[PDB]
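Q: Predict the assembly, please.
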Amino acid sequence: MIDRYKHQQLRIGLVSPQQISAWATGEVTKPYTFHYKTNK
Amino acid sequence: ELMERARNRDPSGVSEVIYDMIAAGLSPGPRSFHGLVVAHALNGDEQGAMHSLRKELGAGQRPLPETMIALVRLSGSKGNAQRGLELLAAMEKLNYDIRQAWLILVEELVRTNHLEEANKVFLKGARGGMRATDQLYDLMIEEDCKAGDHSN
Amino acid sequence: GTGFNKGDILFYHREFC
Amino acid sequence: FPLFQLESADPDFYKIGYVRRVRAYGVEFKEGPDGFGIYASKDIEPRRRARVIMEIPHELMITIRQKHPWMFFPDIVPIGHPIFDIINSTDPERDWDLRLACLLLFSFDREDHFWRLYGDFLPAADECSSLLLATEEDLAELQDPQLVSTIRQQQKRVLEFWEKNWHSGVPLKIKRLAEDAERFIWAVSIAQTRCISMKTRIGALVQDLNMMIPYADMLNHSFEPNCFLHWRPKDRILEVMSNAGQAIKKGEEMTINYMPGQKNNMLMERYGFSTPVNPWDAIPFSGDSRIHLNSFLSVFNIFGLPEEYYHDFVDGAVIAAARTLPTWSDIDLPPIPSAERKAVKELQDECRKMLAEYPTTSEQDQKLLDSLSEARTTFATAVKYRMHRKMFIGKIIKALDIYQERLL
Ligand SMILES: Nc1ncnc2c1ncn2[C@@H]1O[C@H](CSCC[C@H](N)C(=O)O)[C@@H](O)[C@H]1O
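A: Predicted assembly structure:
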């Protein structure tokens, strides 16, 4: 019997600023959440 | 005389003998036509062999298993995997055991260095419920791993 | 459990008769 | 409208099994002049998989380990019994039948053992076909010095073992097992003629066993059988399974392959019988005259590899001929008929010389069998063996003739 091989992995890791930009690319610049009047 | 002419790689002479039988009133059976097919196949002539098989089917005679074995061996030697598969399907339609022809085709395709088509034919046969010999299994595994083909 | 171990010749060639 | 429009076996034979969880499905036991047999009591419809025919529980068997050390399953021999000492002194390789005979005698002496009752349906000394019970007169009719010498060696070995282990000073519990030699000879004959070897798993232990299985030795031998034995380890049951997708008609005999790839001589040595359609029989040819294997196979429609010849007049005799006839092969080289006719003529001459070597013929042997009224079973067995060899040679001749006929 040859085992039905399954090679699956997941790895955590410390992230780089370039990968953060690649995630965003997209920068949040203002602290406003929603419009008080138009709710937009 | 026809089998003689087939043994000296003379398909034209076999055709002369067949026409002599036609003139003499002797109906050409599967044996004489099989000699014609073997004569065509011996000197690496695939088109002539398939023409002889077409003469088979037109003449109304049932081709012998040896004729189909020779045709599949010729196709494997030339690397014509699809032609070999068509011949195997024709063998199946004629109520014949295609295991030996399948093994011969796979081995010929391996020998001529057509490992891709040999692998495809072998996998088709194996998934079709057909069982190969131990030597063929070992040869396929070793050749595929030597070529770096782990998937096959 | 159940997840262990990953769970045409001979045609157009008939006798003319 | 309904108004306008071989014998059955002893019912107790199946009843003693039935009350002990033996089940037979779709088959009935029948008895004839030759002996017991299993036949389909109705029409067995071919299903997708193999069908269960019989089920024999493990506790009703007499099994011994095929390899050292000797352990019995189920363990019927008590600790310290001298029968274990008798068994343990046997040769591990060739003395397997002696151990089974000792176990059979011990079981026959046991009051609560099942085989005390089942042993009454075993063939007697005058009904068993084993050659160990054959005298010198019966052996003289085998017309084969090799088989005769082998049988003499077997008989000498059995009698030497009995004399060595059943002398005057043995305890009463051992002397009553076999008071005199022919009883032990019959025990060895039964063991040889009915032992079944298999690789069985019991619990977590996997091992090979020599097994005396009741109701499964009832099946007759065939080289093209419709049934096979499968061991079920979860409940420790031996299954008799009909082949998957193979229809069986009412009254068709249930047969299993006693041993594959064995010629008629070894069958006669072990089970004391031979068959005329043995596809493994060998005829020693000179090898000077040879025919074309491919043409011979194609004419008779014999396909498959040399170890799996099968047919789509043609029977196991033709397959045996193809396996034993001198043959030549050159991939795709056709045979010219002229040399084939001469080759088959030479082979037919050799076969006729072999037939002339025999003092008598096969038809006269059949007539002698039909006129036979005061002969033992081994006498008819030897006559049938030599007649079957004669018919095999004759079938070879006829097959060669028809093959040379259909070569054009
Ligand atoms: N195909 C066959 N033709 C004739 N005898 C056979 C046979 N297959 C088996 N036998 C005989 O049956 C014995 C196996 S035990 C089979 C049942 C036995 N005939 C009985 O009546 O008890 C062997 O000794 C063998 O001689």
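The longest strand of chain D covers residues 205-212. The CA atoms of residues 110 and 258 of chain D lie 29 Å apart.
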